Design a binder for these strands. Structure first.
Ligand code: HPA
Ligand code: HPA
Lengths: 338, 338
DNA sequence: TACGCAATCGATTGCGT
DNA sequence: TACGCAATCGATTGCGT
């Protein structure tokens, strides 16, 4: 088809090319003629032909976990923004935390020869770790670790620990001493990390959280429900609860409200993520806000760097969470005694 | 690189090829040798080289509006599922309801030569309509119209009208006669369509909704807030409100709760979408459920059809909404008089 | 029997004139 | 000056032997 244009415009295709990419000077008329032909033939040059020659497809692969989850969703849209903004195309793939699915996705990506890879798999067993290395040749950045687990990738790090710590303290400083927690999967950073940060703050306070008061969630609203329910279901109940993520949090609000418990008057609840619509939770949710957009953009940027500036040494950028006060938290019994 | 494999295995590349795609019989040993080389060289065959020859990239383009919105998000994940399931790769692009962005996205897609196109642009002005036709050559299906607006595409249709109608009736049959509505953008199907279905039911009932009682939303929680607020802010207030989408609905719950209004005891609220986490709204939201997954899959399927079975005649499949009773609705003053 | 030769898909780009 | 020739990127596939 490029031959077709050339022919119409009676010039070599080489010409057609250069004019199409202003890659060397071309006589006005000549230029015009080509643009003309280009238009009548209704010409769209093949990127694949081009990619074949130039050796990069101007496309990036996002090997994600799930894309419906608010948290996820939000990050993704960000990344997309950035890609578009710099001419990259997004290939979205969800491995659902399934090795086989992930091996598959990975392979198609290499095959389609994505310029770089954005990795957000949530959990990282050695088998997953291993696979990834097999493709160290393709530039990648993991956006979901607590610290850098490998030498062959870039990494953006969220400080989940300090975020949890922030959550504990607030509660502490607000009058609370009987607290409970519903964490996300321990096999994840946003799970374990948050918990542990939250647990340090407690030890520092000589606060002991009885095990009947800690209940694992899976970042899903339903899990949030069940936990809150198992917590308030007990003889002795905490006066405040720290919930690992806003959506399970939202799940937690439901239950309370269902047993006729009051928020925050009967229970204060503090979340984690500051998801786009947390403010509209009821009550408006107080939570730790995670920089999702920066989290996206920042990742894209390291990728581009390696890609263009051909860096080879893995890097790692940290990002920081921060408390957002809404109305799901109330003074605790010890506020006055501080 | 295919030459590299061949050489290692001392066979023509033609061989390497056939064994790689079991496209003709090959001596075991021969086969083995190639697999061997394939492994040592750590070989991944280029899809782009391949695509160049075979003429289809096994990739599909989703020209969407926004991907963070719950409704959207949910559909997208679906589509992705389907693509993966049949070896297609997803290129996600969000035009934000911006012509220029959409022209751009469209063009890159043609260029990257996507096998087909999934279209979800929300609003369709002639300029957008026009652009689309320009690419009638690439197979596409619009997943967001009320009826088929063009002869060059397939279309999946949701019955937003009958959905709205269902919403009105329920309210009617539940004792209500003073109702208000906060619709989404009229420039959209899920906006206008829902409204009108909802408005028919009302006329049929000889119910008149005073204009101070209808307030436009933009499908976003914030909009939901403001509207509900403007509605309950009045001297005379409805006893029931129909909200165009679950997220604005959620927005509506906030406000009420903020002015100390009760749901559903002071106001019944019925939504639209049955978004994944509507049940965990508080109270659990009664709403019309839209078949998102079928909406996805069904679209993918028409695409594949045109694609593979090389159909040429546009088709159109309808899908159906259905009421889901939760707890945001209460009997109205006229329930007993029916 | 089981395999290979050579042309081809659509672009780009180094030498030249 | 302003443009063109021919080789090339990595695969596939129709004829043959
Ligand atoms: O893995 C996760 N899933 C959903 N929401 C989350 N918020 C933090 N981590 C997660
Ligand atoms: O355009 C829309 N946006 C968000 N949610 C929606 N639910 C139906 N239509 C829409």
């Amino acid at each position: 088809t490029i031959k077709d244009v050339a022919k119409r415009a009676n010039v070599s295709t080489t010409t057609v090319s250069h004019v199409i990419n202003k890659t060397r000077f071309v006589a006005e008329e000549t230029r015009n003629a080509v643009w003309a032909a280009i238009k009548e033939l209704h010409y769209s040059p093949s990127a694949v032909a081009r990619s074949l020659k130039v050796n990069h497809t101007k496309s990036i692969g996002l090997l994600a976990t799930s894309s419906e989850a608010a948290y996820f969703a939000e990050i993704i849209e960000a990344v997309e923004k950035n890609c578009f903004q710099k001419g990259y195309t997004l290939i979205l793939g969800n491995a659902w935390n399934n090795l086989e699915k992930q091996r598959a996705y990975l392979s198609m990506m290499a095959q389609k020869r994505v310029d770089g890879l954005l990795v957000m798999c949530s959990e990282y067993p050695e088998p997953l770790l291993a696979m990834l290395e097999e493709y160290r040749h393709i530039p990648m950045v993991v956006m979901d670790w607590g610290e850098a687990k490998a030498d062959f990738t870039d990494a953006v790090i969220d400080n989940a620990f300090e975020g949890g710590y922030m959550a504990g303290r607030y509660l502490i400083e607000r009058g609370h001493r009987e607290i409970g927690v519903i964490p996300g999967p321990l096999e994840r950073n946003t799970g374990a990390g948050r918990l542990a940060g939250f647990m340090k703050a407690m030890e520092e306070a000589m606060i002991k959280v009885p095990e009947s008061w800690i209940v694992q969630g899976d970042f899903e609203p339903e899990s949030g429900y069940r936990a809150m329910q198992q917590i308030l279901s007990q003889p002795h109940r905490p006066t405040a609860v720290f919930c690992g993520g806003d959506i399970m949090a939202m799940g937690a609000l439901c239950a309370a409200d269902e047993m006729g418990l009051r928020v925050p008057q009967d229970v204060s609840l503090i979340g984690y993520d500051n998801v786009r619509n947390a403010r509209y939770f009821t009550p408006a949710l107080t939570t730790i806000h995670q920089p999702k957009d920066s989290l996206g953009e920042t990742a894209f940027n390291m990728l581009l760097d390696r890609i263009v500036n051909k860096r080879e040494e893995p890097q790692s950028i940290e990002v920081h969470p921060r408390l957002i006060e809404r109305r799901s938290v109330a003074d605790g019994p010890f506020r006055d005694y501080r």
